[PDB]
Structure 1
Amino acid sequence: KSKLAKPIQDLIKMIFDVESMKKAMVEFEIDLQKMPLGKLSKRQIQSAYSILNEVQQAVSDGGSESQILDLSNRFYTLIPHDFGMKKPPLLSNLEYIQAKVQMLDNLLDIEVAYSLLRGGNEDGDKDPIDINYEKLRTDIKVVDKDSEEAKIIKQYVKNTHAATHNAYDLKVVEIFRIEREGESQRYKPFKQLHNRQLLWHGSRTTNFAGILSQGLRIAPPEAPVTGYMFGKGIYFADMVSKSANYCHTSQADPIGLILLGEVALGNMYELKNASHITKLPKGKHSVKGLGKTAPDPTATTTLDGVEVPLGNGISTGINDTCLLYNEYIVYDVAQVNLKYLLKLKFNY
């Protein structure tokens, strides 16, 4: 049997669930008959990114309709889609292209999960749960519900759950302390920075084997800079509500996973509207898209010398901004150190 605590076992079973991986692909409208989980490859995904990059540019610079049709055919041939009884939409609309770029971001992590799942499971002295855990190369521990870490984290969830997101309640089922192999080491240089905060990062449960094994990462080179609001960076939030949305849960699937990461913000380049940032101005370490709501800064606390914006949602002075919520973006994979993993239950 498994030597791991029950909560960690259920966590492993959940992130490595094959049916969840298929459900995700079905939702992205992929044809599972022509494109099964086993056909997915990194190279395929990178080629798909490049095609989306070229089509994005053709739409913007007014390229021949023939070029756009051509690129759409090549995209749909590389990644078979099932539109049912309807005609396949052309990649001639910027929003649909972004939606496709996001799909590929998710497929990248699904590919990692499946490859791990079909990898080295031959050992007999170990339980299957234990073998897959080890594949994650991440030390996972259960945080005591009565401790201060927990209280502080639970307060953070409760208070940053806005008023417009009261379309659901949030219950913290379990909090795990995570530590990815060698992540503390690559993050060390950034402990020298100021404005280090404990921020939220939400994702589909199907992305976690990849997130836990490869850590949060930046879109590959091929991905268009336009497929993302503030360029190719790692995105975080200070309201659980905003992150809780990228979880993709519902009444039929209420359990979600969410990450609390330490991010070395340093000097923030404050923006009120989207910008396809390629480079950061000298002296700046991150980007902060301004929002109309944010936690009350008077209530901010610290946890192991890290700022925790656990304050109640209170409108910010600014109003000429487009974001409802704050958005933090770092462009260096070494500026974040994942700390906790929460298992959340949405009550609609």
Structure 2
Amino acid sequence: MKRVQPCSLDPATQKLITNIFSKEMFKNTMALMDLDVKKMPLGKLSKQQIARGFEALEALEEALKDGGQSLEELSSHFYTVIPHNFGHSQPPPINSPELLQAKKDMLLVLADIELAQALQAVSEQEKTVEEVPHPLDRDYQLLKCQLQLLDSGAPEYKVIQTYLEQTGSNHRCPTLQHIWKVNQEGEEDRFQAHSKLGNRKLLWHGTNMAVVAAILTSGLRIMPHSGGRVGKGIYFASENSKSAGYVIGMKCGAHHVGYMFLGEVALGREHHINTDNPSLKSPPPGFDSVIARGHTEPDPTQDTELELDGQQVVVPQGQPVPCPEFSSSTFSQSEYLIYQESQCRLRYLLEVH
């Protein structure tokens, strides 16, 4: 019989680690994406199954752009591969660009749930050693990501807080519970690459709870099939309220809990757009980033800076104001895009209620 060593983690970190590997959270997330968890249990999810789902969607995408299979028939093949639940009614046909991307976005979420399952697989060393870490220490270590909980007088705390409060929703701003500094090493070497690239900004990336572990483990990624209004890159916001839109928020006791990242993004020379372009896969030549400019922007006169690994990083601190030059933009709020994973380094994780 093996000894379980005592947990080394502070309370807030233990809760985080509990939340982001929770089987309940994962099944909840699946149910909310209309998946049939009884026909697709967590332990049954495979890379192969997900791979076959993307093949099914690629066949649908081809048909949507000659005597081939109908949309109904190719949809029915997708649903055999990826079981959906719609109260045992038939599931609906995937017959629009918008519906196709939605199913691609579901599968990207499902792939990160599977990643978290695979990550947890018990290694052979773990079966032979006579003492095991506390389960939360084990799950934390699996991330290969250092998290340090910040207190009230850490030098960046008030800056982060102010960013959150000034750019979050005016009426029900998310309430800050905790901030962790995130050091995922081996984001470090690729990010050093862009050392001479100026114009760094600390930016929001909101996501659902089911992909936080994957992100902590592998960073923000551009996956085949990633997409959206500014194409195939990694999306950020200067306004917390835009990013908060993507935080599902899991019910725990009397409140909702959710998680948001702050990434240091090396934007370099910016290309500004004012109309949607879902077909972008890089900035134009000689640009390092694409900013889909909002009707509003956090008041640039209130921008401050932080020093992170020797470099100045802009942090907005102002309430959003109007930008007359982009008053007719298709975007109400800015979307900041990079098209290389190495241009972002995760820096903070926030818990918000």
Establish whether TM, by shorter chain, passes 0.5. yes
Aligned to 1:294: 297
Deviation, structure 1 residue 311: 1.2
For 1:195 and 1:180, how far apart are their aligned partners in 2?
22
| Range moving further from structure 2, 91-100 or 172-181 | 91-100
Match of 2:142 among 132, 135, 144: 135
Partner of 1:229: 229
- Determine what percentage of the aligned residue pairs are the same residue: 37
Q: Which amino acid aligns with 1:266?
A: G
Partner AA of 2:272 in structure 1? E
Residue 234 of structure 1 and its aligned partner are, at CA, apart by 0.8
Q: Is the Cα–Cα contact under 8 Å of residues 194 and 343 in structure 2 kept in the other structure? A: yes
1:280 aligns to what?
283
Instruction: Return the match for 2:260 from 258, 261, 284.
Output: 258
* Number of residues of Structure 1 aligned to a counterpart in Structure 2: 336
Specify whether residues 12 and 91 from structure 1 end up closer, same or farther in structure 2 by C-alpha distance, changes over 3 A only: same
The question of 1:178 aligning with 2:185 is answered no
Distance in 2 between the 1:251 and 1:182 partners? 34
Q: 1:68-217 alignment to 2 at 5 Å? A: 68-120=71-123, 122=127, 124-163=131-170, 166=171, 168-217=172-221
Matches of 1:130 and 1:69, distance apart in 2: 47
Supply the distance in 2 between the matched residues of 1:251 and 1:74 (Cα, whole angstroms).
34
1:326 positional shift:
0.3
For the aligned residue pairs, the C-alpha RMSD in angstroms reads 1.8
Distance 1:173 1:89 in 2: 40
Measure how far apart 1:215 and its partner are.
Answer: 0.9
- What's the counterpart of residue 308 of structure 1? 315
Q: Flag the 1:56–1:144 CA change in 2: closer, same or farther, 3 A.
A: same
Q: Which amino acid aligns with 1:335?
A: Q
**What secondary structure does 2:175 align onto?**
strand
- Preserved contact between residue 196 and residue 265 of structure 1 (Cα < 8 Å): yes
Gaps of 5+ in 2: 1-5
Q: Distance in 2 between matches of 1:311 and 1:262?
A: 18
CA shift, 1:147, in A, is: 2.7
The structural deviation recorded for 1:138 is 0.5
**In the alignment, residue 281 of structure 1 is paired with which amino acid?**
P
1:161–1:313: 8 Å Cα contact kept in structure 2? no
The DSSP-based 3-state class of the residue aligned with 1:38 is helix
Whether 1:41 and 2:43 are equivalent positions in the alignment is no
Higher alpha-carbon deviation: 93-102 or 130-139? 93-102
Task: Give the TM-score of the pair, scaled to structure 1.
Answer: 0.92
Q: Which runs of 5+ in 1 are unaligned?
A: none
Contact 1:198/1:260, CA 8 A, preserved across alignment: yes
Output the CA distance in 1 between the equivalents of 2:47 and 2:343: 25
1:5-41, Cα deviation, whole Å (9 max, x unpaired): 2211111111111100000111111111211112212
Match of 2:60 in 1: 55
Three-state SS of the structure 2 residue aligned to 1:81 is: coil
Cα distance in 2, alignment partners of residues 169 and 279 from structure 1? 33
Residue of structure 1 equivalent to 2:3: none
Q: Deviations over 1:92-145 (max 9, x none)?
A: 122221211110111111111112233346453411111111100001101121
* 3-state DSSP of counterpart to 1:284: coil
* C-alpha separation in 1, matches of 2:333 and 2:269: 19
Structure 2 SS opposite 1:269: strand
Query: 1:65: how far off?
Result: 8.0
Between 76-85 and 48-57, report the one with greater CA deviation.
Answer: 48-57
